[PDB]
Write a protein that binds this ligand. Structure first.
Ligand SMILES: N#Cc1cc2c(Oc3ccc(F)cc3OCCn3ccc(=O)[nH]c3=O)cc(F)cn2c1
Ligand SMILES: [Mg+2]
Lengths: 539, 403
């Protein structure tokens, strides 16, 4: 008989804010009659109670015509910000396989938890009378109103308090709390598991929480938060792609987002060309049609992920897809993936394959700690010697967790390396470039110690472009080994960052030239300081 | 017995997201917080508390027991700077000059003092759960928390009465307190200093990490001394002198540049004229003298720039105004295989030095990508405080000149 009453959460309005006061909009005679019946039963159950004329607050009430809808949108604007319930949803690949797993959705959940007495005044609502010839019947909520800002967060905190003693005393069961549902799983025999489930349902009934019975409890395969959970595997719910229309910008969310959603289990999914179109409103580049063809082939056969096994190692393997796209798989045994995914290159003017690989590792590392609480071992398509040369000579600090090289091309490589000391026997090219901002006219060229010279006139250019062009000229007109002297700090910052691809067409040409050289030493000197080789006069 | 406290006007409490933690760190935080709620240091809170402050776990000085660290940086800024009023602790200038200084963790003393009933909601933190399978445990601090700015200021009253005898008994030893760390300096022998340190340690038990400031100030700018100079050698020299000419007024490079006249090969030896050799000497003596008009301003922010020099070496400079370095140094050192563990140790060493010299931490400029630093810096952090930082994404040319 003891009901073990739930303790209310103290709730206040936002500071410098008062309760809501809204107009009771006119209702048809049938809707008024329909709301009277519901409120009488709800008042009989104790969920609401009639209020006097003292209350100065009002929230509107509508009928949709045998359903009651109290819109607390104004009270929500004025109720305090509650603590955020867990924003993320559990990922299936992080779940550990159990002999049995039971879903229990609590019914009439918010109405089973009371409300702070001092806040019940703000939940006031008036049902209009018929023909407006009688004062409307005023009510106030006594329990968590459905649609109120604090109803979910208060219900969760109340549920967790009740579940704590049962969980500590039943260590063999594992409980997961997510919104209004509880997911229990155990490795016990199916008989003892179902008996323990009935204990938990009795515990919740002790505190006044209704549960589904053994025959009413849903059984696998569970359809939950877009996934399909099975006793031994998991996958996403079947894919949905809209063909209509042949020309439509509605795919700004449908096609890419679903391919993004399928990317967690379907490997090799690409969205770059299709996401390019976005760049309430379209053409399809021929490169985007080839992406869906390879995507539809990946989406052809259904795939399933496995559940997590803490006893085995956690492995992650990355592949380069091209155009800043990366794909990864996370697994513990070969050919059986826990999950998959992709990484998109951050937008930049100059980038490096090694840099993108590092950012993908960090991304996967953070994702793994969220899901499994540990960093996976990496299998990366980069030679151990390449990473050592890169990290030892990079100006920034860089680190990658424990990893091993997997030889699945395209392998990530360093395409060029500058000398640290000047080259003996190599021609010394002094390069310089300048332009006039008014006329956009400029010159680029070089002078060398062998007496070789060149100056090229240019149109529609800037000082920074002419200084890049001068280096490009020195690279074109030089042998396999060359020393280059520049005064352009801008050109040095690009090359010391070591790009392999760039948005500027000129830098990519310089990159292509560096790749063809044997040894390149790049030196810097201050401009206009009287260095003999700096031929700024030639411009 | 509690001391009132409130945020600065027009600033709400901290609402900082908790970042994910590994499983080993979640276990450590669960064991620690279970004991703290039994001891009354913290108590679980409900959903009416929207405020949150992140929390993580470390191991300090190769000790097996895990420590709980709370990133109160947001709260400290939103905590009344006046919480320092009455100016907290002054910075003793004699601490930087003492031959030896030792740092102790006095944070366990803060737990004996209670926090104001109103301010406890702002000290809310969340122990995260793996895979969001269950809501995170939320506590709030009933007592003064470690890492807070008010906790040393509040306890400074008791701290003076606790250490008043040892002070009067040992007048030459200097004592300083920053956050949960107490810095005590002496001029005695290290072994005598360490045994004398146990005297202060016993005193702390009754009521309830060795560095040596022999660093020798801002390191000078140094030019090579060669018998033969190549075109490349002189080109690097002029570039460095032109750089130092922003810091030093009298630097002249005209005579050395005259030697580079014409288009010559980089590896060609150039004999030095007597006029140019004179110019190099006049520049050396200029570099031997100190920087002109360099002062510290307690209102301004300290800036720390770090440059990776390779092979375990790191250079750093502390300044409030550019080209007016208050201190320069090099950290040669760790983990030869891990650049990030080196940088994290470097950031901690610099911050420790900055607490001894000025009594406040600098804002760092780290030569590292934001996403790489944010992923790994907690795995190597061994200090009780946390400084602010930003990320340099453009390679500084001055890296060579500080080498
Ligand atoms: N609808 C729904 C629903 C159920 C669950 C959920 O259930 C579990 C609870 C505790 C546990 F120790 C394991 C669990 O599942 C492991 C994987 N699994 C799944 C199905 C199956 O038949 N067998 C099986 O092993 C956990 C969770 F985080 C979210 N959930 C949503
Ligand atoms: Mg120029």
């Amino acid at each position: 008989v003891p009901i073990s009453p739930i303790e209310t959460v103290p709730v206040k309005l936002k500071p410098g804010m008062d309760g809501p006061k809204v107009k009771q909009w006119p209702l048809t005679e049938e809707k008024i009659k329909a709301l009277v019946e519901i409120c009488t039963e709800m008042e009989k159950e104790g969920k609401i109670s009639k209020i006097g004329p003292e209350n100065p607050y009002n929230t509107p009430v509508f009928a949709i015509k045998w359903r009651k809808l109290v819109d607390f949108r104004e009270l929500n604007k004025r109720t305090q910000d509650f603590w955020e319930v867990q924003l993320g949803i559990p990922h299936p690949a992080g779940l550990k396989k159990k002999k049995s797993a039971t879903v229990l959705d609590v019914g009439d959940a918010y109405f089973s938890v009371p409300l702070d007495e001092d806040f019940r005044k703000y939940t006031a609502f008036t049902i209009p009378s018929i023909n407006n010839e009688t004062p409307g019947i005023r009510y106030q909520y006594n329990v968590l109103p459905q649609g109120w800002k604090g109803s979910p967060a208060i219900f969760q905190s109340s549920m967790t308090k009740i579940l704590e003693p049962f969980a500590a005393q039943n260590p063999d069961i594992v409980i997961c709390q997510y919104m209004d549902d509880l997911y229990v799983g155990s490795d016990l025999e199916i008989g003892q598991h179902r008996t323990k489930i009935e204990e938990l349902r009795q515990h919740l009934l002790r505190w006044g929480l209704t549960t589904p019975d053994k025959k009413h409890q849903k059984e696998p395969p569970f359809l939950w938060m877009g996934y399909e959970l099975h006793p031994d595997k998991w996958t996403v719910q079947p894919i949905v792609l809209p063909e209509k229309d042949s020309w439509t910008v509605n795919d700004i969310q449908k096609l890419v987002g679903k391919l993004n959603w399928a990317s967690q289990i379907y490997p090799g999914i690409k969205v770059r060309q299709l996401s390019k179109l976005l760049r309430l409103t379209i053409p399809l580049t021929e490169e985007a049609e080839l992406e869906l063809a390879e995507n539809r082939e990946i989406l052809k056969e259904p795939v399933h992920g496995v559940y997590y096994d803490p006893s085995k190692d956690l492995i992650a393997e990355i592949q380069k897809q091209g155009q800043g796209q990366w794909t990864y798989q996370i697994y513990q045994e070969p050919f059986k993936n826990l999950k998959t995914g992709k990484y998109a290159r951050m937008r930049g003017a100059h980038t490096n394959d090694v840099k993108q690989l590092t950012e993908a590792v960090q991304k996967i590392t953070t994702e793994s700690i969220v899901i499994w609480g540990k960093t996976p071992k990496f299998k990366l398509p980069i030679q151990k010697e390449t990473w050592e040369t890169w990290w030892t000579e990079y100006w920034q600090a860089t680190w990658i967790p424990e990893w091993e090289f997997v030889n699945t091309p395209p392998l990530v490589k360093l395409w060029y390396q500058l000398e640290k000391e000047p080259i003996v026997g190599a021609e010394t090219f002094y390069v310089d470039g300048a332009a006039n901002r008014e006329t956009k006219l400029g010159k680029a060229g070089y002078v060398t110690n062998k007496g070789r010279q060149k100056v090229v006139p240019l149109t529609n250019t800037t000082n920074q472009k002419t200084e890049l062009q001068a280096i490009y000229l020195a690279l074109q007109d030089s042998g396999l080994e060359v020393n280059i002297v520049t005064d352009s700090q801008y050109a040095l910052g690009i090359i010391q960052a070591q790009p392999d691809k760039s948005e500027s067409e000129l830098v990519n040409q310089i990159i292509e030239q560096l790749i063809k050289k044997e040894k390149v030493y790049l030196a810097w000197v201050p401009a206009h300081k009287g260095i003999g080789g700096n031929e700024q006069v030639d411009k | 017995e509690t001391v009132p406290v409130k945020l600065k006007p027009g600033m709400d409490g901290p609402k900082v997201k908790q970042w994910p933690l590994t499983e080993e760190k979640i276990k450590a935080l669960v064991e620690i917080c279970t004991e703290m709620e039994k001891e009354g240091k913290i108590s679980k809170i409900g959903p009416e508390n929207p405020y949150n402050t992140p929390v993580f776990a470390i191991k300090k000085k190769d000790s097996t027991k895990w420590r709980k660290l709370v990133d109160f940086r947001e709260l400290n800024k939103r905590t009344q700077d006046f919480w320092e009023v009455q100016l907290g602790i002054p910075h003793p200038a004699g601490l930087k000059k003492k031959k030896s200084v030792t740092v102790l963790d006095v944070g366990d003393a803060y737990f004996s003092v209670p926090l104001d009933e109103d301010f406890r909601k702002y000290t809310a933190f969340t122990i995260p759960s793996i895979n969001n399978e269950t809501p995170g445990i939320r506590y709030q601090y009933n007592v003064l928390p470690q890492g807070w700015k008010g906790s040393p200021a509040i306890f400074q009253s008791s701290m003076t009465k606790i250490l008043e005898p040892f002070k009067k008994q040992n007048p030459d030893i200097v004592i300083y307190q920053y956050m949960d760390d107490l810095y005590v300096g002496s001029d005695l022998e290290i072994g005598q200093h360490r045994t004398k340190i146990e005297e202060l340690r016993q005193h702390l038990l009754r009521w309830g990490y060795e560095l040596h400031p022999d660093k020798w100030t801002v390191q000078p700018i140094v030019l090579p001394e060669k018998d033969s100079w190549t075109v490349n050698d002189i080109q690097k020299l002029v570039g460095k002198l032109n750089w130092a000419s922003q810091i030093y007024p009298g630097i002249k490079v005209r005579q050395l540049s005259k030697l580079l006249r014409g288009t010559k090969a980089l590896t060609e030896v150039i004999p030095l004229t007597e006029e140019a050799e004179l110019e190099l000497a006049e520049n050396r003596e200029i570099l031997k003298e100190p920087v002109h008009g360099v002062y510290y301003d307690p209102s301004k922010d300290l800036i720390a720039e770090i440059q990776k020099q390779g092979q375990g070496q790191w250079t750093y400079q502390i300044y409030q105004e550019p080209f007016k370095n208050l201190k320069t140094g090099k950290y040669a050192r760790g983990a030869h295989t891990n650049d990030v563990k080196q940088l994290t140790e470097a950031v901690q060493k610099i911050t420790t030095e900055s607490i001894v010299i000025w009594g406040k931490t600098p804002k760092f400029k780290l030569p590292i990508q934001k996403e790489t630093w944010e992923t790994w810096w907690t795995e190597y952090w061994q200090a009780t405080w946390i400084p602010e930082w930003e990320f340099v994404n453009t390679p500084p040319l001055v890296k060579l000149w500080y080498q």
